[PDB]
Structure formats: C-alpha cells, structure tokens
Symmetry: D2
Subunit: 261 residues, 4 copies
C-alpha cells in the first residue's frame, strides 16, 4: 500500500525510519508522501500531532501508526524494537482500524477560518484581560473571566485537559470537554467551575466582551487572531483512523502512562 | 391516564397535591399509585429521588414530572404556580418524553444484589481504611486508598459528583463518571486523580484488598454490606423517562441552578 | 537519660527495639515508659502518632524520634540500618531539639472535652446531613454543607489535608489550616471553597444547625460525640519536640515523600 | 499631614477626589504627591495596586487608604458615601496603622533586578514550553513543567492565588505561597501539585532548564525578561502600612467579597 514515515529528526528516529523503509522495500509497498494510505510517525506525541496536521485533508483515506522513541507516546502503540514486526504485519495487512473523534474550531472575523484538533483548542487573551461570554446552543451560559478556556477531544482529555482538572473520557464517546483556566469567582463574577462535557451537534460559542484579540491554539499551533467576532466549537464530523494490530485498550494506555509501567 | 402524586409532606406540598388531584378529577384521569403511567413529585430533589425508587420496577411504563416547592429542584421542571397549567397540558396529553441514562450497581457476596441509581452510587469503608483495586473491563487499573469512590450518571454529575470535582455531562451521553474522594498519593501510593468517564458496556469492578465491609450508597439510600467480594458498575440498559411540555434545556437548567436565576 | 521505645509489633520492629534496648544497656540510659525523656517510635506514622498520644501529658519533657521500618515515615528521621548510630548519638546526647505546632480541639456539650492533634482534627455527620455554621473569632463566616471539615497542623498538611487540596505549610509557621470535604455549592448554598490558614490566637468555632451529633477524629482516633453545642479549633500553646541529630529539612522530607527517593 | 489622592480617572472617582481635596482644605492638611504621609486611592484594586507601586520607595513613611467606587475593592475599606467622615477622622488623626507582608522578587541575568509585589509575582514562558527547576533553600525540590508558577503574599492569596487553588492566609502570617499553573504530571514528569507556603527567610529560586526567556508579572506589570539565570522569591523585609479607622477584619472582608454582602 502507499505509505510514508515522518521522523522526529534525531539520530535514533531517522535511522529507525530508514530501516523501516528498507524493510518495506521487501514488500508491495510504495513510499508516497503525497497520497499515503498509511502514515507512520516516529518520535513523540508532538511528532504524531504534526503527522496528523500534515495530512488533515485526507483523514478519511489514511490510517495512522505511532512509534515512540522516547519514554512517552500516548498516541504511540509501538516501541522501536517491534518495528520489524510492524513492517511485516502492516505489509500482510489485515489490521483493524479504530477511529477517534476530533474537534472543529471555527473562528469568525469582520471572513471565517476552521481548524481541526486532535488534542484540544485553547483561547487566551492577547496580553490584556480575557473576558468572553459562553453561549451553548444559542443560550448565554456564563461570562468567563480568567486566563483562558480549553476545549478537548476525548483523546485529548489525557493531555492539557487533564492538567486543568478535566475528566478522562473514553474515545468511543463522541464528545468534547471544556475546562477553565484560572477563573475569577467572587460575589460579582461567577463561572461554573466544573468541566463541561458536550455531545455531538452541541455548539459552544465564545463571544468577546471588550477586547477582540485572542491567542488561539490548535494542538501545538498557536496563532494570534485579530478582530474576532466568535469562536465556535463542535464535535467534528471527521475522525482520525488508527491502524491497530493488537489490543492495547485505552484504559491500559492510561494506566501505563500515569500509574505505572 | 393513570397517575399518582407524591408529596414532600409539608403543608405547602400536601395542599398543592390535593389541588392537583381536585383538578385532575375534571378529566379522564384515574388516581392509581399501584400502576401509574404518570408520577408527579411535589417537593425537592430528595422527593423526586424517592418517587423514582418507589417505581423503579416500572420505569419503562412511567413518565416522571417534578414540581419544586423550594428554591432548588434539578429534576423539577415546574414551579407551584404553574400547577394548573400542568394539569391541563398533562390531561390533553401530547407531551414529549425524554430519557436519561441510569447506573447499575451489582454487589456480590460469598449471593448478588443489584441497585439502580438516578444520581450516583458511592462506596466508603465500614469505619476502617478504604482500599480497593479498581478493575476496568478485567484490567487492573489502580489500587485506590482514600475516603471512597463515587460513580455518577450524567444527570447525577451536577450533584455529589460536582462537589468532588467531576465534570458535568449532558444526559444524552450514555455514560457514567467515577470520581475520587480524598485519595492518598505519595511515592508509594498512586491513583489517577482525574475523574474517569466510561461509555456503555464498560464494566468498572471494585475488589477488596483487606477489609471486605463497605458502606454503599445508592442515591439517598446508604447500606452497610458485609462479606463483599465485588462491586460492579455499568451503564444500565434501563432509562428514566420525563414528561416534557416545553423546552427547558439541560445547560439552561445548569445555568439557573449554579450561575444565576 | 530516661527513654522508652514503642514498636509497631511485627517481627522486624520488635527485634529492632530489642536490639536498641540491648545497645542502650551499654550506656547510662534507664528504660522507663512512665516518665521518659526520650520516646522512640519504631514503625510507621501511625505508630509515631500513637507514641505522641500515649505521652501527650508530658509533651514539654519529651523529645520524640521516629524510625520507619516500612517505606514511608513522614515523622521518621531514621532507617533501621542507622539504629546503632542512633543509640550512640542519643547516648552521647548533644542533639538539637526542634518543635512543631499542635492543634487544640475543644468540644462542648449541654461539659467540655479537649484534644490535641499532631496531624489534624476532622468533623463529619453521624449518618445524616452535615451542616455547620463556621464562626471565625465570633464572626459568622459561612454555613458549610457537605461531607465534613478538616483542620490541620503544619506537619499535618502533608497528610489528610493534602488529599483535600490543602496547602503544604512549613512547620515553623504557627498556624492551622481548614479544608473542605465535598462542599455543596449552588445558587443557594455557598462556601469559600479555598483552604483557610489561621494564625495563633484565632479561634474557629463550628456550630450545629440541625443535627447535633458528629463524628470527630483526632489523628487516628474517631469518636461519635452526642449533644454537641460547639467544636472549637485553635493553635495549641503546647508543642511537640523532636530530637534532631542531623539536617533533614522539611522541604527535602516533602521531596523524598512525594517527588522521588 | 502631607497627603495625596490617586483616582481611577472616571467621572465618579475624579469628582470624589476633588470633593475630598476641598474637604481637606478645611484642615491642616497639605496636598503633596512627592512626599505624602497618607496616600488615598479612589477606584478599584487595580487603582490601589498602582498607588502602591507609585510610592514603593517610601513604603516606610506612608499609610494607605482605599475607597472603592465599584462593587469590589479588597484593599478598600471605604465606600464613596463615607468620604466626608474619612476626611474628618483622617484630619483628627489618631488612626491605627496595620502592616501586611510583601514579596521580594529578584531576577538575575548574565545584572540584577528586584521588584516588590503586594498581590503576587508570576512566571510564564516566552511562547515556548515552560520548564524550571525549583530550588528551596538551595535544595532541588522539583522540575516544573506546565504553564507557570505564582508566588503570592498573604493579602494576594484572595487574588490570582485563589483562582489557582491556593489557600487563603491571614496577613498576620509572614509568608509567601507558591501555586502551580497547569502542571504536567505523568509517570515521567512529577510536581508536588499542592500549594506550598514558605516562611520568612526561606528562599525559592527558579532556574531555567532550556529556554532562558520568561514573562514575569509583578501585580499588574508584566515584562518579558531575556537571558534570565534565576528568579528568586523571598518574603520582603518591607511592609505596606494601612491607616485603619475602624475594625474591618480580614475574614469578614473575605466573607463580604466571596460569600455574601
Ligand atoms: N503546546 C505547548 C507544549 C508543551 N506541552 C508539552 O510539553 N506536552 C508534551 C507532553 O504531553 C504528552 N501528551 C500529548 C502531547 C503533546 C505534544 N505537545 C508539544 C508539541 O507538540 O510541541 C503539544 C500538546 O501539549 C499539551 N500541553 C500544553 N500545555 C500543557 C500543560 N500545561 N499541561 C499539559 N499538557 C499541556 C497540549 O495537549 C498540546 O496539544 N498529547 C497527549 C495525550 N493525548 N494524552 C496524554 N499525554 C499527551 C506528551 O507525550 C508529552 O509527555
Ligand atoms: N445523601 C446525603 C444527603 C445530603 N445531600 C444533600 O443535601 N443534597 C441536596 C441538594 O442537592 C441537590 N441535588 C440533588 C439531590 C438530592 C437529594 N439528596 C438528599 C436526600 O435525598 O435526602 C440526595 C443526594 O445528595 C447528594 N449529595 C450527598 N452528599 C453530597 C455532597 N457532599 N455534595 C453534594 N451533593 C451531595 C447526592 O447526589 C445524593 O444523591 N440531585 C441533584 C442533581 N442531579 N443536580 C443538582 N443538584 C442536585 C438538591 O436539589 C439540594 O440542593
Ligand atoms: N485515619 C484513617 C487511616 C487511613 N490513613 C492512612 O492510611 N494514612 C497513612 C499514610 O499517610 C501517611 N502519613 C501520616 C499518617 C498516618 C497514620 N494514619 C493511620 C493510622 O494511624 O492508623 C492516620 C492518618 O491518616 C491520614 N488520613 C486519613 N484519611 C486520609 C485520606 N483520605 N487521605 C490522606 N491521608 C488520610 C490522617 O492524616 C490521619 O492522621 N501522617 C503524615 C504526614 N504528616 N505527612 C505525610 N504523610 C503522612 C503515612 O506515612 C501513610 O503513608
Ligand atoms: N493582571 C491581569 C488582570 C486581570 N485580573 C483582574 O481582572 N483582576 C481584578 C479583580 O480581582 C480583584 N482583586 C485584586 C486585583 C486586582 C487588579 N488586577 C487588574 C489590574 O491591576 O489591571 C491585577 C490583579 O489581577 C489578578 N489576576 C490576574 N489574573 C487573574 C486570574 N486569572 N484570576 C484571578 N485573579 C487574577 C492578580 O492578582 C493581579 O495582581 N486584588 C485582590 C485581592 N488581594 N483579593 C481579592 N480580590 C482581588 C479585583 O477587586 C477585581 O475583582
């Protein structure tokens, strides 16, 4: 099948990628980084995140595989020592594909821009004070004052969302989760405090109150947007697909990453 | 239709129930507290919780309606002043039914007991130290040391779960959420910390380590169980049905209860 | 000097105590468990806590030393392998004494009882719902609804207080810290949420609202008190004294117990 | 006495200041904004913060007074309606002065800069990832990865510190409190999590690991510092003095600001 391999770019990852390419040469596999059907990522979660965004226009035609060369890799299923067995199983095919939900961010100006997030999308102020009205399905829910907000996919819940006190959600749940960053709460200013978990087709809109300039992050990418009228969050209709060759359940992955391994 | 009305039992609620019965007498409505199709609860959430558990064997044949006579009532949709309009709309029928998920708790001994929860089920120790192994879909996830654990339905997430730092989840999500109560974490003892959100068909089992006696709560009911071998949590296949006569969205209900009203 | 040794009571601790007694026999040291000047505790923090409460009437005439035989021991300064060096240094004397603050709990009825805590004192309800008015220096501060409250000494801040989200406080600060256990907060019920840190001479009183029966803990001891009119917390004028033979700073002790060792 | 009055600069505050100046003209009071002995601040806490920093070189010779013209004012003791009584009492003198502790921040380069904070000093990264080693009294305590750190005075504990989960500390306690902003914790990265409370003479140093550029805030002032070798926190020897004309206790001030008023 058509395939490509991204590398973190250190010596370990580059040589691992070269050896897999050499191994792939022994099968009906064509290296193609324009229209791959299989995208392998060799490095950390940052590397896997960059592989996702490199091919976010072809998510429907691609299955992803992560190899972690450090001690981490939540999106990784394979250690560097299993790489030969990965080549062989991937060549013979017959893998099972699993899909995780993604988050759609729409940014409107006074012009529209959409982004897709695998981990989360966050909003902070452009230096000044961050104040936004939070509107859920056209209902004014709260006026948020504080550092920012974080909207997470299910597989993102173990990332920034976790550090903000959010819940960890199994990725079979088509949802997104909103967490607060250092909200101000006194007798005049009130936010819900708790993380909020939204189903598909629910729309969370953030609307400016004074300043209209915000720093918006999508996974690792952070951009300053000016003249923002609205930031709109919904569960995407698009999904990321992983090639799975063995059982590595989400809650064991959580256990291995946070409890012990 | 067949109907019945439970009351909190103070003067306000008893007289409101009597006036609705008098009002219902002017329609083809039969008061029947054995096999009602409509169960009205006049009081607080405690009163609504008791109405649910009074009829938990007929959940499939019943639509519930809550009237709050205090300043509260998350499961209430109606103030006492709208009661006449409620009688009339309920008599004419043509309401829409909505369903919220429920939580199944199974308790095994060395003998089995199942319970249904609308808010949550919690586990604490019988005086001694609480230590349980947490097993998710037969995978040992963690050994929990601390005060206890709380497993919440979606509509329970605004109740005890919220006070434990859990996320608020829209009830259209068929899930349950596990929160920690004062976990011990040092270099030898480790829990995940974060709330965990589980989909349908996922099974969370709690298994004793030393003591086998636990205080188990199901909504307001708290029972000491002895010789416990396992406590098993899953999303129930049963659902509670509410009669809805107008739009009162979950997130507005959350806003009204916690932000402002 | 006069000394005594308490043991956890397993084989390791009993034989360690016997060997130290044998070692102490080679110096001008008299074993006396009625009026010791040195109290050695061999076991865990539970064992050290029991040694403190065994001699809480002679705190001014006693220096404590902890030996941890497990992997833990926040109040321990010594591993079992250093016990011979401990005997020798303790015999030669010339140690430095350090003092940590303690917490005074006063419980009034309709009759008065005082208790001294090294870790903390907690209050919960006797089965029913816990509601108390919190009065600081005779000023009504809040009405607490929830599971309970925890008042911690500085050295207790790394114990139950920590699991409740409290701050870790250096023991040179003569203070006590109040933390909430699962407080109810909605638009009608409001608590401060945050831990509160009180100086010496500040008095925190808890006063019942409906039920007057409470479960009160003092370190490991938990007693049900009936007909309670008031629970009064203040920093004690009494202090626990530790014999110190080398520098083991509080923040390194915290690092070793929670970060890495 | 020598006095001056800062104003927020809206119509309400400017006219209030003019009326107090007119009122002060009827007493032996000289308006002097170079060497005042009394500094009155008319506005919000932001206004009071700016008054403190305008005169931070003469803290020993100045007593501060806050008048809040909005609904807030933690450092304010007076509403605009009491301003005439304030002029009269301040003219007759015989007020009592109270002192709150302050925080010293030292920033070293490869050159030294010191700052004084009334609320807090915070550190974040200059766009990249924030990683610092936390050294307490020359002991390496932890390597912090996350959004940033916040070091708070006692009177700052109700401000940013509170929103970060920190404890509220009575200002008679000469301490500073360190809180985490969204720390990363997994099986490879570990921070203490809990807020840390440090006494006088304890030194907290933050030392870079990779990037040496940081955004450092001191109260409202936020500056990007380059080539930073160390950020050093200690309780200052300097104190802010407030003129007090009546009892308004700290815990009532907390109650009024966060519970009800
Ligand atoms: N954008 C600022 C860069 C600083 N963040 C950072 O050092 N994160 C890397 C660590 O997180 C792990 N990770 C990832 C990741 C990654 C790569 N990362 C770096 C890059 O791409 O350059 C971007 C992400 O970073 C996270 N992040 C940012 N700030 C914080 C914070 N304060 N606390 C916690 N996470 C934070 C956000 O969610 C970004 O999306 N996804 C997951 C996951 N699904 N589950 C469990 N672990 C996961 C990864 O293995 C490693 O252990
Ligand atoms: N079992 C000990 C009794 C003490 N609990 C108590 O006074 N709760 C009543 C308050 O909570 C509101 N509520 C209910 C409720 C109710 C009735 N309640 C009393 C009864 O039945 O006697 C039993 C429930 O109590 C909750 N609970 C227990 N302990 C705590 C705690 N520490 N913190 C927060 N909640 C707690 C548990 O989830 C029980 O199921 N469901 C929801 C909901 N879905 N959404 C939002 N508000 C809700 C209700 O309007 C009122 O404002
Ligand atoms: N009363 C229920 C018994 C269950 N508690 C329990 O297993 N605690 C033992 C663990 O905590 C460590 N510890 C102690 C201790 C001890 C002995 N303990 C047992 C006994 O005496 O039987 C009584 C204390 O327990 C604590 N506790 C109770 N419940 C919780 C909870 N949910 N979360 C966290 N702590 C809790 C309270 O503060 C009691 O005072 N002091 C400190 C300290 N100063 N600093 C750091 N670690 C410390 C000790 O090394 C061991 O690792
Ligand atoms: N630097 C970014 C500006 C955004 N911050 C903001 O709107 N804060 C104002 C609100 O906080 C109250 N306040 C102050 C204050 C003030 C003036 N403020 C604005 C200015 O000077 O322009 C600077 C301070 O802001 C705080 N801050 C910043 N970010 C957050 C956050 N995410 N969450 C909570 N607080 C935050 C920090 O501690 C700064 O020092 N001191 C106290 C206190 N001692 N006790 C209780 N309330 C207090 C004040 O009445 C008002 O209700």
């Amino acid at each position: 099948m058509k395939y490509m391999i991204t590398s973190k770019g250190d010596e370990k990852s580059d040589l691992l990628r070269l050896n897999m390419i050499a191994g792939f040469g022994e099968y009906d596999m064509e290296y193609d980084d324009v229209e791959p059907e299989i995208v392998i990522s060799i490095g950390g979660d940052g590397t896997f995140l960059s592989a996702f965004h490199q091919y976010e226009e072809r998510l429907d035609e691609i299955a992803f595989i992560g190899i972690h060369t450090g001690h981490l890799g939540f999106y990784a299923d394979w250690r560097p020592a299993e790489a030969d067995k990965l080549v062989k199983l991937l060549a013979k095919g017959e893998y099972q594909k699993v899909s995780y939900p993604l988050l759609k961010t729409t940014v409107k100006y006074g012009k529209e821009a959409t982004y897709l997030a695998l981990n989360e999308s966050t909003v902070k102020s452009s230096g000044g004070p961050f104040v936004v009205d939070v509107v859920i399905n056209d209902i004014h829910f709260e006026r948020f004052r504080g550092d920012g907000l974080c909207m997470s996919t299910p597989s993102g819940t173990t990332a920034y969302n976790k550090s903000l006190g959010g819940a960890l959600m199994h990725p079979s749940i088509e949802a997104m989760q909103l967490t607060e960053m250092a909200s101000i709460n006194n007798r005049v200013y009130r936010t819900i405090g708790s993380p909020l978990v939204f189903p598909k087709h629910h729309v969370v809109s953030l609307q400016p109150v004074n300043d209209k300039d915000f720093q918006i992050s999508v996974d690792h990418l952070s951009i300053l947007h000016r003249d923002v009228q609205e930031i709109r969050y919904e569960v995407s209709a698009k999904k990321i697909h992983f090639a799975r060759f063995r059982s590595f359940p989400f809650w064991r992955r959580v256990h291995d990453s946070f409890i012990e391994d």
